[PDB]
Structure 1
Amino acid sequence: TELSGQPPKFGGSTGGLLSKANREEKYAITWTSASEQVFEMPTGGAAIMNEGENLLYLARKEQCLALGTQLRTKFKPKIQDYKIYRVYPSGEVQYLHPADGVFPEKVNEGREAQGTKTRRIGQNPEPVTIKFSGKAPYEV
């Protein structure tokens, strides 16, 4: 729906969003803070997160995830309620992280298994046996 939260206190920088955010895509990180704190900006320099809700727009998903790891690993009351979404130029918002409300580090029911091979690594088919096809040993 509509992303809510106060922007962090920041004086500006040249490492933020570019034309991609409006032409292609953008990302958003929201998080609640127990107090006005100082954090490091993935785009360079320091910023101040407000006490309460904080919404911040970033250019790439890895930047939001770096901010999330910093929130959850570098503060006395660990910030782990952060959410990462992807915003499109049509204003559409796609919730991303954590996918099922639970961090992917720990198991949670309801998740399907994708990219899982029943065989071993060294049990891949020889390439000559699948040549002149559009597949590779790790795909059949």
Structure 2
Amino acid sequence: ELSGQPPKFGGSTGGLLSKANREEKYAITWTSASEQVFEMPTGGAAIMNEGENLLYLARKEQCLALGTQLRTKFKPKIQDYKIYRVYPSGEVQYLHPADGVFPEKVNEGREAQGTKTRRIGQNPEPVTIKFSGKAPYEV
């Protein structure tokens, strides 16, 4: 499964709701060298332990916001945070980072999908592709 040792937090009302155990939730794990204080994206501040920490949140944006805070708002930076999606059936899908290297930097083994080979000004006219169920970008 996953690791443990949740950060020392008093809890709040801004945390998980029913969807967490009915649709999906998210997990973020990271190893910190000191037992310090960070800001919970759900309101309030929590103490993260010295060693490994695991935290459950409701949205991927919250996990990535906490990752940004970890990476930027600490003098000894954190680079080993991992974000998984936890399905209600216990199946865990490892989301971020995808290949282990940060997406901001070029790395081999990527597929280059979503790329058009034309300029944005060379898109086909809407009238020509009428009754095709596709917008100009879709072709």
TM-score (norm 2): 0.99
- Residues 49-108 of structure 1, C-alpha deviations (whole Å, 9 max, x = no match): 101100000000000000000000000110110000000110000000000000000011
d(CA) in 1 for partners of 2:62, 2:79: 16
For residue 138 of structure 1, give the secondary structure of its aligned residue in structure 2: helix
For residue 95 of structure 1, give the secondary structure of its aligned residue in structure 2: strand
Unaligned runs of 5+ in 2: none
d(CA) in 2 for partners of 1:138, 1:127: 10
- Residues 18-71 of structure 1, C-alpha deviations (whole Å, 9 max, x = no match): 000101000000000010010000001000110110000000000000000000
RMSD: 0.5
1:111 Cα shift? 0.5
1:11 Cα shift? 0.3
Could you say which residue in structure 2 is the equivalent of 1:36?
A: 35
d(CA) in 1 for partners of 2:57, 2:97: 17
1:134 Cα shift? 1.0
Q: How many residues align structurally?
A: 139
For residue 138 of structure 2, give the secondary structure of its aligned residue in structure 1: coil
d(CA) in 1 for partners of 2:47, 2:106: 34
For residue 130 of structure 1, give the secondary structure of its aligned residue in structure 2: coil
TM-score (norm 1): 0.98
Could you say which residue in structure 2 is the equivalent of 1:87?
A: 86
Unaligned runs of 5+ in 1: none
d(CA) in 2 for partners of 1:41, 1:130: 49
**Percent of paired sites with the same residue:** 100
